[PDB]
Amino acid sequence: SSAGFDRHITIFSPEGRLYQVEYAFKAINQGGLTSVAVRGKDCAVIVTQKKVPDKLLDSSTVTHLFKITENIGCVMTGMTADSRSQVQRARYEAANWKYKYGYEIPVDMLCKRIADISQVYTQNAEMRPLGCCMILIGIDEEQGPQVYKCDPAGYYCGFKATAAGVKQTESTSFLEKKVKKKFDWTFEQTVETAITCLSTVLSIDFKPSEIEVGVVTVENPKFRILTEAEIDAHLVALAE
Amino acid sequence: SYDRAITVFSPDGHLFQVEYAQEAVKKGSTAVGVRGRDIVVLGVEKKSVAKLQDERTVRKICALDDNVCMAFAGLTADARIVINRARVECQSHRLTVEDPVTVEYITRYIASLKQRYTQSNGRRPFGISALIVGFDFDGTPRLYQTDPSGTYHAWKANAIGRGAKSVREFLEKNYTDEAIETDDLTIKLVIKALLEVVQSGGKNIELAVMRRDQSLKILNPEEIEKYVAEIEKEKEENE
Amino acid sequence: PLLHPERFVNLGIEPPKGVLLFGPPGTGKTLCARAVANRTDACFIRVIGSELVQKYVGEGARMVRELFEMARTKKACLIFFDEIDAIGGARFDDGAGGDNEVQRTMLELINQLDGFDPRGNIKVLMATNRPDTLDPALMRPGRLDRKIEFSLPDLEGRTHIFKIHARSMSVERDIRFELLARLCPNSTGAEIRSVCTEAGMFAIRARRKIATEKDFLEAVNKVIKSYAKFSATPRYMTYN
Amino acid sequence: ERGYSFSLTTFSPSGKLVQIEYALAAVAGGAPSVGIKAANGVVLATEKKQKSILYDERSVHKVEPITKHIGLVYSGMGPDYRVLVHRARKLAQQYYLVYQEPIPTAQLVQRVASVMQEYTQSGGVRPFGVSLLICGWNEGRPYLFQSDPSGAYFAWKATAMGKNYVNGKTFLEKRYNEDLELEDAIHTAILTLKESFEGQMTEDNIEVGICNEAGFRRLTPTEVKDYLAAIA
Amino acid sequence: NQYDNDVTVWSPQGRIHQIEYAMEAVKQGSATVGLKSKTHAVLVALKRAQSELAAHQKKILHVDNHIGISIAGLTADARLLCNFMRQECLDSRFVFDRPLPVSRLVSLIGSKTQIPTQRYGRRPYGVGLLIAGYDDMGPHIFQTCPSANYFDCRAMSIGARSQSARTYLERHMSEFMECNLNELVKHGLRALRETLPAEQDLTTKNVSIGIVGKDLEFTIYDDDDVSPFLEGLEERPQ
Amino acid sequence: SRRYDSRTTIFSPEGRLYQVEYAMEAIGHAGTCLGILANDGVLLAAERRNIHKLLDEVFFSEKIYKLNEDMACSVAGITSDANVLTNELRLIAQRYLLQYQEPIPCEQLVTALCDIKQAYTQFGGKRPFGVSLLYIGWDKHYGFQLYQSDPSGNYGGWKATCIGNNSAAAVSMLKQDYKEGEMTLKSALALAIKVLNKTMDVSKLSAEKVEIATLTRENGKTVIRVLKQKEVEQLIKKHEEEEAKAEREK
Amino acid sequence: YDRGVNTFSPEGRLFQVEYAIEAIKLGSTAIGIQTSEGVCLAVEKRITSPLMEPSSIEKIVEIDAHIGCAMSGLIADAKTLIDKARVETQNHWFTYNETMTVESVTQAVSNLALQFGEEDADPGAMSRPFGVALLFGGVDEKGPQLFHMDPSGTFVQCDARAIGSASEGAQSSLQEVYHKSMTLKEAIKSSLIILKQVMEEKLNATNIELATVQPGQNFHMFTKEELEEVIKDI
Amino acid sequence: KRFDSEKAGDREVQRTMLELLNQLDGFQPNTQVKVIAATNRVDILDPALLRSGRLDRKIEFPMPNEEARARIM
Amino acid sequence: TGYDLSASTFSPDGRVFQVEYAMKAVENSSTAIGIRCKDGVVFGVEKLVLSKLYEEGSNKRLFNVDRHVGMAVAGLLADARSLADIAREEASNFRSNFGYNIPLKHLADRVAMYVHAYTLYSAVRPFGCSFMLGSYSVNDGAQLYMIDPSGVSYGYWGCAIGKARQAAKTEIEKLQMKEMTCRDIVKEVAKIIYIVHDEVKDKAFELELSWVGELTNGRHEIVPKDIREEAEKYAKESLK
Ligand SMILES: Nc1ncnc2c1ncn2[C@@H]1O[C@H](COP(=O)(O)OP(=O)(O)OP(=O)(O)O)[C@@H](O)[C@H]1O
């Protein structure tokens, strides 16, 4: 199934597939964390788990949520330094678009440009194709909320509910079963479903000090991060 | 900007690419050349006429300037660029010191180019050997021989290409002062030498002479038959 | 140590046991082994690596065990291994298990030379032409203490080889061998013997009875300069 | 940084370029696509299918308009399509700037083929892994063209590309002619693309674009849903 | 072995082999010793000749009127590095109009030598530079390596078969701090002689000495006026 | 970096370059083009390979290209490199015309293109060009001219040549029946038809499976024509009836 | 199975420089002697065919009016160093207006030997050190001098030097017939004797060449009329 | 280590290794015999052999330092 | 075999091997400990003396990046000095461009990005150093950060880098740093240094300490001699 250096660089194997991109998808799961993004009627939420193994570490600087722009929110999965570089690149691109064209950049154009940048690595053979994922959420006029996903292969798509990490398949199946019912979603309902999907996939019944929640809604499009008190209130409301 | 070493030193002190180039040279057509009192004669063999060619587009005897000519043996493609560069250098020499180029100068230029082309980074060596014949100023005819390595020598008679050892051995035992006394005797000697080993039965010979009076004068295949018949009669009624 | 085993015991010194001979092909190893086997007075058990490649599993180790048992039965005598680079290179088991039964044979051979009462009064000596591929665990002292190296002769070795390979000739009184030695800067003994044989054949060619200097010169020209196309030498001086 | 600058495509002892064959074998495993031209315009049809119900079917489009009267569809790799689309648009704009006239389809096809060829000889670069179908209508007569990873291009009358394309070509052999209409062309294109569809043929699983003497345009979901009726 | 073909790859044991090979290559140079007193710094070198009809190779160079060096390895890299040092000292003297302190020079040498050990298709410099100088902080002696790593020492000896010299230097380290030149040079010469066999020691033709002091600039003594430092040396113990 | 390099510009122990030979063997397939001249006018005969039932037949030409006002060329091999080479030599001719205000002779254009083609077998480390092509033209210095190129870089004049796949048999028949300075532009077409019949195994020589181009001279026109499909079947039927008559005679 | 241009051996030697060092054991032997009265250089031509012109091949060339150079090893790539030396001497004369010594010539020509590489600049050199060995002879402000330069980039001062394929034997012979009170005539005679002993073919007036330099006159090369009288008195 | 294949394989030694694994721990506990094992290359060894219940303590031997070398001499 | 010869290849499991080898090389340093107090940061390094020849204070492993920033190093020395130089240059550029002292959360990100830039391409190699940055500011408090060869930068309350990292952090845990001022914490650092590195490993060693905080009024500098001497005097009582 190999002929030459098709196992070592990005060239076509005799069967028509190149393995160096499939290896990054396995490299994504090295971290061991799972994140979910849900879209509602007039809001969008991101939920992620975070673990601090020891008390020596400073727990205030292990966040996996980043703020690219005052209206656009993001979350990463996989390697850390690659995600940091990608976030830096995204911030630069958003600032450049705003300066050059005089109005805020739509989320879909940003995701398309990020995928276009990340597609070159699988074309030239002198570089490694940045094995980390990308999830973006935002609000946009005339369309409402939007959630977008981008993967290292140079591919992107818009969604209504997404999960990325080690437990992608089970959470995807749960979200599909839930969304087939076609029930109208509100703020509390979206947050509750987002929390319960992770809770039932992991079977942990976690405390309010090991999750991160980010929200956006049509009353103040500013991206904001929930505090611990609000998370505790949501958790106690969830369990009757 | 491709930059990788092609020619390197072997573990026993050899440059194998130059040796392979010489091996490629040793697979071409034969070229013979001699110099005389006032006429310098050079000939090529193994014309291999296919009765469909044009005799004026497959020639191997080139005229660099009004007083020098050369014949090559090796890869045909590599000869054209060397010929063109030599012509450009010969023409550009006249804008400087007005005297026409001497064969020493052009031979040194060609050898220097060939040698430098195996030191620069990311190129393969040339695959041709050359015989340059000319009569410079003051009336002194002379010929020179150049190698792909970058070494050039001065001889009195040479043969290069395939099957050159036998021709050289024949030439070493038949070059005398009286054999170069007559103008036509040198041409007869060249025809006899070029017919020694390589078959070249009369119709596979292209000879050219320079009389140190005018430009290159290639001869049509009419007197070649006459010279062949004369040599045949000399051999037959010699005994 | 086998001839006068009284001074070593008196001085309380235990002599080394093994030795390996490496160098380019043609240098001399097998001829030196022949000389050793001639001068010896004890056994001489010869074995070639290609004889230890069997058809059924678990046969090479049995053969090695039988060899060492038979050797231990007698008082004290020598074993010779020829072309050891065919019975074990290195443990490299990756993917599907390939070339590991030969590794078991090599492991049995290693085990028979150390641990729990080593073989004792047995001396082994091995030769190879590319020693760069042998296993690290086999080359440590205690098994291969001595590492004699055979290299191409410098200048006087060639003169000595010329003198000893042509002292049964029919030549005149005015042949100088220093010039002949200077004309072959990097050559082996086999090439010199072939030069002498070809000079003799050129003498026999036409009619004559006495080989002349020109015969030697043209034999050198035809054997060294003309056969350098093959020459076998340049790519083994790097032991690859 | 710096690249490699040595060619990654080399001649085999049998005189064949292996990487081009591998690229073609990768193209042959893509999504099916069909293209038909009949006497009034051109129709390009393709079959798209989402893995699950979470995907949004109104986010990305298989059919893209290069300009007012040229359309283009692909078959093969996903990401490799977008750069080609962008390059084609840029080339068209350049031509419009130079000559103040809309670019003919043949010139655009030639330029795209030249780019795809130039992209398989430079240093340290693998060939493209997609194939293209281009449709246009310039100066009365419509035009349909097909590109190739090796850089060659041909002019067709009815083409099936992608997975299981030999049977599609056989089907088009026995139905196509030189005297039809745009509507019957759409009907036969849908019929021949139905040979590889799943158990159901929903409107969301088909992309259809039509180019006539009024300009290239992609059909709205309502029109495709209507056209799917009265068939099969 | 495929882990020892270039300077870019890492061995599984967290080591790089080309740097180790360069350090091994440094060991073929002839022995040399350097040390410092309270107000002086001296360095002695042992020459070597190919045949009896050839002159001995020179070791001690002259970088600046307050900085000297000693080399060990292949000479081309030593010449290049000496040229770099001279250019840097001249630039500093031209701009700020004051002598350049030794520590900054050694830092510059280390920074320049670090670069070729990270790129592709390069090689480290094979040299064993020992640097001696005097500045406002007193005497100074430094050692550099092909690994782009320098040290600060009080007495050092490097080259081929330099372990015996190091042993002698470490044994008699206490007395160096107060003695004057007339016995400091003798200590250095004894340390150098320790590395030789019992055949020939110091026949006034294969020894060179270099001194830098507070009131005197860098000076080199070679094979003619070296004799005053030889007489009075004790006979070799047997 | 140098582990992945293939070293596509080195010699070989026997003294030949492998990549050029492989390219030469690649042209051993994919087409059959022949040319012959003996008097006023030169002709090109080519075999069409794209013979599927669903084609549009656009551009009024398949393998015959125009390079200048009075030049023409065919090609055999990889098509994309053929496009590159033709597009590159067109502006060579144009810039010669710009500089000298005089049509460029065939020799200079052929030598320039051969130099460009040879440049890739000397340095750069890139894949060479797998294209071999024929040139025909008329110039005021030597009348009509025909030439053949080579991926190696060398060229040469000719009088009748085939560069296709069965070129050996075509050359044999061309040399078995050809006259010097007698064949006008009427019997050369018959000879081309005979050779095309023999080379291609497919019988009956369907008129849409071949392409013929001619170049004649006028007062000042030098017209290059691609004769339509309505003047091919008559030549084929004349050939077949002549062959039947000859067979019946023996 | 491909290494780099300038990798290091486990022994720490090198690979290209060693092969260059042992690639000069194939050239013709050359002998140079330095005396308090002058400097003499001699080399053999190694004629191979009667048709070759013996005067065409040359091994001793002059750099300036008082410096000469003898070459061994390869010959095709030894022109660049000679031309560089000529240009350096001319530049020094133009700038400082004085005849610059031979030590400086040797230093300037040896600084260029170790410059090969394949990753830094475009002119460069493939992988090849100059596979030649050079002997420099001359007279300067401090007397007559002879120098030996080697492909490794290391130059040294010698009193009587022999290079080429017969280096070891020639030097073993030279080591017993040299002393500090030796004149030009006996130096030439001894060099001729050594060359005659170590040559392959017979020695005559057209197989070798010689050149001497004295403090009085400039660089002078012998001719075929003053070279035979020193031969018959061998 | 074990592996998966369909053209050819090496299974007899794997079966003896499986029996050896079953002897340690396994269905029947043993508490009268002790096991010591020696090797010099661990990365090519089956993970089931390196379980905590089968081989409890793992000792690594480092290369000797200066003092250890002096003591050995 | 052949998946770990380049930094631009993914192993089938999905991880780069060269950075792991760089971490293994880093794992042979001595020790470096950093603890943040209520009003500053304290560094401590134990340094091994190879021989008596080396002068006291050579091979300093405690640099000065800026007027208010420290630095602690473990690993190779050349790469450490290169990183120190690049950090100095970046801090100087930031000060000159904007006009005020650079915060740590930005300098650490810049240096981490520069380090990560080297683990993508095959024309360079990963770094072999791991380092710690510390500082104090009046309006920002005390800051500590840790960066490794991979390019991951985290904040900490107390960290240890080197050979015995675990045996040192297990003793940092018992310490309570959240309250007590760092006037006596130097005693704890000394005591935690002397309870590591058994005398069998090496004969002797020396101690190096740093200081930055409100006591030093922002600037980072070496601890006074008398305070250090009292620290060793207190820490020498571990024999009880
Ligand atoms: N020192 C020597 N004196 C004389 N002859 C020698 C010497 N060394 C080698 N030879 C020649 O080498 C020839 C073959 O040598 P031998 O087979 O022992 O070499 P080797 O190194 O074992 O070869 P290989 O690697 O091919 O097995 C002998 O016939 C002999 O002529």
Ligand SMILES: [Mg+2]
């Ligand atoms: Mg043998």
